[PDB]
Every structure is written in C-alpha cells, then in structure tokens.
Chain length 216, copies 5
C-alpha cells in the first residue's frame, strides 16, 4: 500500500523522494566499493608485511617488486621508498641523507595511497548528514500542503488532512533511511582507513630502522 | 499559490524570508565562484606538474615562469621556491641551508594560495549552519502570531489558525532550502580544497628531493 | 502587544527571558569589541608589513619601533624578535643559534597577541550554543504551566491554554534571537582570527629568511 | 503490559526494535570488555612504572622482561625499546643514533598497544550516534501507520489512533536507551584511553632521559 | 505545587528524575572544585612568574623551590626542569644536550599538571551532552504512559491525558537544567585550562631562552 502514497503526492515531495532514493542507492554502491577497496588493502598489506619480516633480504624483495607490474599498496610504497635509497647510494651521498630522502618519498607514498582507498568516504559523510534534512524539507512541504489545503474545505475532519500528513512522514522516513546506512559506513570505513594508515605508517617506521642498521 | 502566502504575512516573518532568500542567492553565487576557482586550480596544477616531470631541466622551467606575467598556483609557488634557492646559491651558502630556505618559502606559497582558493568556503559553512535556525525563528514567530491571534476570535475553528500555521512552515522550509545547498558545498569544496593542498604539498616534497640530489 | 505577554508571565519564564536578553546585549557588546580589535589589527599589520618590505633596512625599522611607546601587533612582535637577535649577536653566538633564538621569541609573540585579539570570541561560542536551549527550557516550563493549569478549569477550550502556549514560544524565539547573532560572529571572527594569525605567521617566516641571508 | 505492545506491532517497527535491543546488548558487552582491558592496563602500568623507578638498574629489569612470556603493555613497550638500544650498541653506533633509534621503536609500541586497548571504542561511538535515529525511523514509521490507518475508519476517535501512537514512542524510547549507555562509555573510555596513552608516553620520555644520561 | 507532580509519577520517570537531579548536584560540585583549582593555579603562576622575571638569579630561585615542600604548578615544573639541567651539567655534557634535556623534563611537567587541573572537566562534558537526552527518554516514557492509559478510559477528555503530559515535560525540563550549567562550565574551564597551559608553556619557552644565553 505504501507504494501507492509515493505515487500520488505533490510534485515537490516526489522530487525530494527521488533525490533521497538516489542518495540511498549511491550510498549502497559506495559502501560496496569502499568494502572491496579496504579488503584488498588489508589482504595485500598482510601478504607483503609477512614476506618482508620473513628471512629474505631487502635486495631480494626489491627485485620481485620491480618485476611485478601489479605493484599496489605497501609493495608500491616500498618500491618507491627503496628506489630513492638505491638512487641516492649510487650518488655516494651520506647515510644520514640517504635515510632522510627514503623517509620523505615513502611519506609521499603512504599519503598518495590513503587518498585512493578513501575513494567515496567523504560523499557518505554528506549523504549521511544532509539527507535527514532533505527529508525534513519534504516533510515540511507536506505538512504545509495540508494546512494550505485545509482552509479551502467546508469541514475540517481529521480524515481530510491525514492522507496529506502521511505523505509528509514518508519523506522524513526515506530521509532517515538514506542517512543511517551512510553514517554507519562513514564511521566504519573512516575507522578501517585509520587502521590501514597506521599499519602502513608503523611498517614504514620499522623499514626505516632496518635501513639505518643495515647502513652502519 | 505559495507566492501569495509569502506576500501576505507578518512583517517579521517576511524579513526572515528575505534574510534567507538572500542567503540562498549568495550561497549560489559563492558555489559558482568556488567551482570556477577549484577547476582553474586543478587544470593548471596538472599542466605544470606534467611539464615539470617532463624531460626539461629546472633551469629551463624557471626561465619560462619568470617570462610569464600570468604565473598562478603551482607555477608561482615554484617560481617563489627556486627564486629563493638561486638567490642563496649566489651567496655561496651551504646546500643544507639552500634546501631548508627554499622549503620554507614554498610552505609560504602553498599556504598563501590555499587561502585564495577557499575564497567564500567559510561563509557557506555559516549560511549552512545558521540558516536552518533563522528559518526556525520565523516558524516560532509564525506559530506565536497564530495563538496570540486565536484568543481574540469568538470561535477556535482549526480553519481560523491554519492560514497562520502555514506562513510559519514556509519560513522553516525556506530555512532548509538556504542551508542544504550550502552544506553540500561546504562539504564538496572543503574536500576539493584538501585535494589541491595535498596535490601541491606532495609536488613540493618531490621538487625538494630533486633539488637535494641535483645538489650532491 | 508582544511587550504585554513578557510582562504578564510565570516568574521562571521571565527569568529565562532576562538571562537571554542580557546574553543578547552582551553578545552585541562583544561583537562590537571584536570588530574594533580585528580592524585595528588588520590596519596596523598592513602599515608595518608595507614599511618592512619597503626599502628601509632592519636596523632603521628597529630604531623607530624602540622609539614608539605605542608598539602593538606585528610591530611589537618584530621588536621582541630582533631584540633577542641583537641581544645574542652581542654575546658572539653562532648564527644558527641567533636565528633559532629569534624564531622562538616571535612564536612567543604571535601567540601572546592572538590571545589578546580573540578577547571574547569564546563567550560568543557559549552564548551561541547554550542560549537556544535556555530558551527551550523556558518553552518547556511554559507548556508545562499550561497543562498543569488546564486540569483545574471546568472546560478545556483551546482559548484557555493558548495564552499560556504563546508565553512559551516567546522564550524559544528570544532564545534563537540571542544565539543567531553569536554564531554568525563566533564564525566571522574565528575566521578573521585565523587570517590575522596566518598573515603574521607568514610575515614571521619571511622575516626569518631575511635574517638568515643578511647573516651569511 | 509494555511487553504486550512490542509483541503486537507492524513488522518494520519490530525489526527497528530488534536492531536496537541488539545494539543495546552489544553496547553492554563492549562496555564490559573495555572496562576489563583498561583496568588490566592501569594495574600493570603502575606495577612496572613503580618497579622501573625502584632502585634496580635497566639491565636487571630487561633480564626479567626477556624471561616473562606474559609481557604486556609498558613492560613489552620497554622490552621492544631497549631491545633496539642493545641491538644498536653491539653495532658500535653513535649514542645520538642509539637514542633516536630506541625512541622510534617505542613510539611504534605506544601506538601499536593503544590500538589494542581501544578494541570496541569506535563501535560505541556509532551505536551511540546512529541508534537514536534508528529509533526515530521506527517512531516515524509508527506515526505513519496510524494516519494511513486513520483514513479507513468510520470515526476518528483519539482512542482509534492512540494504540498506534504508543508503538511509535516505544521505538524512540528503545532508541534513546541503546544510545545513552554508549555515549557515557565512548566518553568514559575515550578519557581512560588518553590517560593511559599520556601515562605511557610520559614514561617513555622519562625512560629516554635515563638512557641519554647513562650514555654520557 | 510542582513538587507534588515529581512525587506522584511512574517509577521509570522518577528514576530518570533522580539520575538527573544527581547529575545536577554533581555538576555543581565539580564546577566548585574546577573553580578553586583554576584560581589557585592562576594566582601561584602570577606569583612565581613575577618573582622569576624579578632581578633574583636562577640559582637563588632554585634554592627557595628546593626548600619549599608546598611546590605546586609552575614552581614544581621549574624545579623539575632545572633539577635536570643541574644534574646534567655535573656530568659535563654539551650545552646543546643540557638544554634539550631540561626542555623534555618540563614538557613532562606542563603535561603532568594540566591533567591535574582539568580534574572533572570531562565529566561536565558528559553530564552536559547526555543529560538532555536522559530527560528526553523520561519525556517519551511519560507521553507513552499517557496514550497507553488513554485507550482504557470511557472518555478521552484532554483533562484525562494532561496530568500525564505534564509529568513528561517535567523530566525534559530537569534534563535541560542538569545540562545547561555543565555546558557553560565545560566551556568556561576548557577555556581557563588552555589559558593556563599557554601561560605556562610560554613561560617554559622564555625560561629555556634564559638558560641558552646564560650558557654561552
């Protein structure tokens, strides 16, 4: 029956209800994209991180990464890091400089891949914050195309207004239904984003340490 | 018909409705200015960034920038950066100092052009936050020039109050309509602003690296 | 007529309405003080900043500042900065130290004059945040000295309650009227405060640069 | 009697009420886990911190920690710290480096154990923020399966709607009851988390100081 | 008369009203403790700060502090600072190190006494944020032990419900009355806390400067 009400409403409330059902649908597409992105990230980070803290030397690891054309996440942040370090050593620079250099070009890798994991995470924040109040605008337009209507009729039976009051609440309900899934995913992926940054940041620190020692 | 109601209302609610329709109109002007500013920024950043990471040497690039009187964005941040570096080298200073110097005067370029991209972005935050509650003040004044009125009449027909209740909801609706476009643009341009800062910041880091190597 | 209602209300709602009309009046006094403070700041910053980047040498500028007893803003932050630098050089310290020193005692000038521009800016944040909800407390007390009253009367005519419902809405209206001017000035002066800090901070950086070069 | 209402409601409001009673129950499980985690942390920190600032030398303490397989919190952050310091000294590196090294690998211990104390603290923030508005969605669905119903009946007795209005308010009440215990524990454990970070951070600083002196 | 209503209410609303009157009372106790703590702090800071920038040498000041067993605030932060500096100099360490050392052990004094001024300041933030919504839960329980009641009676006189609607609003009023004094003191003491940190931080910077000069 609810389907019927949405079909037979003021043009304005109907546009609010499309703006919001599209926000709902886009929310859900982003929540699928962000979930895939942050599962690939977590998986490849564990794979590389394991292999790096496995016996095989830095040089060995660097060889493989250079060979792979599918370098992604930590593996690419590592390749870009050591690429700098090897490129400097060849120019017989001081260790102090070599480390400082390699530590700049992998803060310029852990920040240029955070940006590409958090693809839609800001949109979900908007959808989540605005959408409730797009709904509310629909509600107010609805309650205000009752009372504007009520004046005209001979008799103010509650039954006169009520069909119009419903078509208001529908819009605020749709508003809350667009907004809730998108503030339980701007919350869950903002968390997963800080986890992955921290995991990779602490791996970067621990890789630096290795290089300083392997130097002296 | 709605037009009619706004025309025939209490002086106070009418002033709330002008304060808000002007906020709406100014929001929209800022949302056009910010959109132009951040598209020129993104376009010129890609152009320069491409050309810099193209084969041509630093000196070549510096020549062109000095020639151009339309220096804007990264190109001006670069000119001001290297201008410092060339100005120091001529005073036979230590490399360490030369880099530190050039790295200060282009943190004093990526921060004195962020401020000029984000022209109106703070206004949109105000319009977006306050305007809902300017509307609400209109609503309350409206519901309170019903009930104050209701007392006077012989008979409290719902039909008596309803024309006055509408002219309240209109103000809260206009309030939400000023405020929604300006919290979907204090959200979208705050994002585009952090993108452009990060893009230019990471370009600054990568330019520093080049200079350190080209030194030793 | 509205004046009449405020005069003839429950003692509690009347105290809410004084607490709020005083917040309104104090808001407005602070919004005048903050506006004067941040216009003098912006004016003197441009004057000094112009004169400094004018031809005249550091020593010349330092002379004048020492002479003036009305040293304020950048001019005092500069005097305190160079005063350190001159005081060190006389103790034949290393350039490196001289700069580091002068750069500490003018981060201890750009932070001990930010605090004195932002005189009342935190109060406006309170007035702006609380005052809506002081009003709401008045509203609830009002709606709750209707219904508590309604029980007593022989006949529940809407006309019985309505004079009491109004005197509630008045309090929430006054609440919104205290709070709106003080969240469009905790927004506008927080902005002007960050502008002046940034302007003076970037001037401090550019003054440091001069001193480092004038050293070597 | 309340039990009866929840049993006899629209399928949708019933699902809102399960989503929320589960959030309530999970909140409470997390509030128990976080309380155990932060009491063990506070207890072991005091034990170690006491013993460290007790007479016994660093070497003595390091011996014991290496022996213990139950190393947790400060004791493990200390073992990982000194392990670096001892590992460097053996490679006859400069004191300056030894300290810098040991100070990196215990910022990579106070940050990889903060993450494991704050196990569920982010969930409580979600439950606390969303759950009120899941409830509200239930409320609106409820008020909107009254009015949609009201139209149908011959007579609009208040008594007709009221049984349906209740089953709405139940959902917003359950919504507030899920959300309040979880914003008085995302507040209380965010506090206890910053306490434990600060306590351990300041212990790390004071341990560094000891090592620098014991060096020279 | 109001007293009567609170006495004759549903067990649940009565528990909400005790939870909130206790929050009110605890708020007020904390607002007294925080006010004493931050007046002693401000007073002793001015006393010491005056005496330090008075003629008497560092050594003189250090003597007195060592003598006093009532060392508190800046005076203790200073004693702990110089205690480090004197303890290093005796171990004939380089000036550079002596300053760095003394500057670490008084960032580990301005942060271990901020924590002890801000005793209850976080509680006031909770009371202030939650308490409104504890009240609202009481309100909803109240409006929902009207309508659940309304069904039963033969006749739905407004006069039937109204005694029950009041006992709801009382709870939201008490809710706002717990919460307002505690967001005008989590605002006023968060401010006074940042003032005292800044005052002491800038004193620490200015003390460091003295030591560096008195060294060379």
């Amino acid at each position: 029956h609810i389907s019927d009400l949405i079909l037979q409403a003021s043009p304005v409330v109907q546009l609010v209800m499309l703006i919001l059902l599209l926000a709902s649908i886009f929310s859900w597409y982003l929540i699928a994209k962000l979930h895939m992105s942050y599962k690939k990230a977590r998986q490849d980070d564990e794979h590389f991180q394991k292999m790096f803290w496995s016996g095989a030397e830095l040089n060995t690891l660097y060889n493989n990464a250079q060979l792979n054309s599918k370098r992604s996440g930590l593996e690419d942040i590592f390749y870009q890091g050591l690429s700098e370090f090897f490129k400097l050593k060849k120019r017989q620079a001081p260790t102090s400089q070599m480390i400082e250099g390699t530590e700049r070009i992998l803060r310029v890798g852990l920040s240029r891949d955070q940006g590409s994991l958090e693809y839609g995470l800001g949109t979900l924040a908007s959808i989540g914050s605005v959408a409730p109040y797009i709904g509310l605008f629909g509600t107010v337009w609805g309650i205000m195309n009752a009372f504007i209507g009520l004046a005209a009729v001979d008799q103010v039976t509650l039954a006169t207004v009520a069909p119009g009051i419903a078509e208001a609440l529908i819009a605020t309900a749709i508003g809350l239904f667009a907004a809730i899934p998108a503030v339980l995913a701007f919350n869950h992926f903002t968390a997963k984003s800080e986890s992955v940054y921290s995991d990779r940041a602490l791996f970067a620190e621990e890789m630096i340490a290795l290089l300083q020692r392997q130097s002296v």
